[PDB]
Write a protein that binds this DNA or RNA. Structure first.
Lengths: 140, 141, 140, 135
DNA sequence: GTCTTGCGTGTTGGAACACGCAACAG
DNA sequence: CCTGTTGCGTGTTCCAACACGCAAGA
């Protein structure tokens, strides 16, 4: 799924906080070729994250997915705990998205043990198909 | 100038230290050719850093170039580039192939020059005692 | 409070990272003359640091105090932000203390502006009278 | 000396408060910085000669009228001799040196340092030396 | 003098570790 | 209700590239 694009060495997918909101998250409901076809669809909360790399269409130390919009939602042998401060993403002065940090703890809150597996969950600002886009990676 | 590879949206150039040395410096170095000139030949030491972006074929905040190899604080334009840190080594599969040495542009006459936010990362090939170095260029903050 | 000791010119107070822990911080709970009597007691976090020199018993470009053991603790028109790496102090192989760096920013985190006023906060390693000893000086 | 107190005289003090007190040939209450011929010696024998000093010892030595041989080595000058001022008047230069062992320039470097403070003059004569070992 | 690589420690601001305000259930 | 239980932000300190600039020899 990589060299359908025929990429030269050194090139990587380094999307902005801004691109992810506008070009990916927003465009999927609309049906875009490169958008329908370039990122794997999955319910992230059914699995332990260390299973995910083999199920991701690509990635070397980071992976991206679309997952159903929703607390300490259970996944595998653990739970996701919000960390840091949600940040607002703007393009040309409009709020289009929110970047949210999470940390995976194994076990059951608040008796869980922290792990190094991390998520960044990006969402659009809007009232009541409807997905969030998530980045996964491993610390240190 | 990139647009002969129908760029996917979102894609940017973040080659590893290991790739630049080997996939770039060597491809050019065995003197083998590239499909396209992506990293252009230039004499970087004839120039002001602020004129350089105009010379890069692409790059938004970084531009990379190849420049002819020296056979220290080489004067270039209005300044001098000052070396920094400990030159660091690039390895591939347990073999050493290159050193990236960082520099900063000072304007003026050494050592009475003044510091800038301009950085160079210069990648070079290893050898025993058609000769190029590879330079990453960018401006801080 | 200086020439009770009758000092010859050229002499200054240049305590080691090690002396401050052992001879000063540790000895005060014990009631030592030169220790009760040589360093001013103050709650550092009620004041802006540029007020402190007149309230310090001595110092020319540096000042030292004992202050109550405790985040972005407000002081005056600002906040103290941890900087660098906490360092461990040992004497003859025992950890007796920690040296901690801080920088004063004016305003309210994380919208503060950095100033050149600096602190080194030294503390003993022990569960929960109980003070930290702090050095103050000015960059540049 | 009370506990905690150590000798960290400024560049400006050493020149004036020390070198001059001795230099107008005026006396001191106590000899704190002793007279010695430093260039007769190995740096590692020197601490034994300092009347105090834990990591630094300072001494006074008779004055020259370059890489002066001393003991098993030679001292090599470094940096740009730096100037000491007091109240906008220049009074002295501190020049740093390092001890090399052997025969110049085939000698070998050490961790031994000298800072030599000296008095200014026009075209009973001493220099003042700070001694210490690095790292 | 002139002009350098090669080590040192400041300054930054990034993002994770652990405490309670705020809410759902029991 | 009025508490018991089950999540979620938000202010700290950590951890670390990156070079800054004396300073040394080249």
């Amino acid at each position: 799924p990589l060299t359908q694009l025929s990429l030269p060495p050194g090139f990587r997918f380094y999307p902005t906080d801004e691109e992810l909101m506008v070009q990916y998250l927003c465009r999927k409901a609309a049906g875009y070729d490169f958008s329908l076809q370039l990122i794997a669809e999955i319910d992230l909360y059914k699995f332990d994250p260390w299973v995910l790399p083999n199920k991701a269409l690509f990635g070397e130390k980071e992976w991206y997915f679309f997952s159903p919009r929703d607390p300490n939602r259970v996944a595998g042998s653990g739970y996701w705990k919000a960390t840091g401060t949600d940040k607002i993403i703007s393009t040309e002065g409009q709020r289009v998205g929110i970047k949210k940090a999470l940390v995976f703890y194994i076990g059951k809150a608040p008796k869980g043990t922290k792990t190094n597996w991390i998520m960044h969950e990006y969402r659009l600002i809007e009232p009541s198909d409807d997905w969030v886009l998530c980045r996964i990676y491993k610390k240190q």
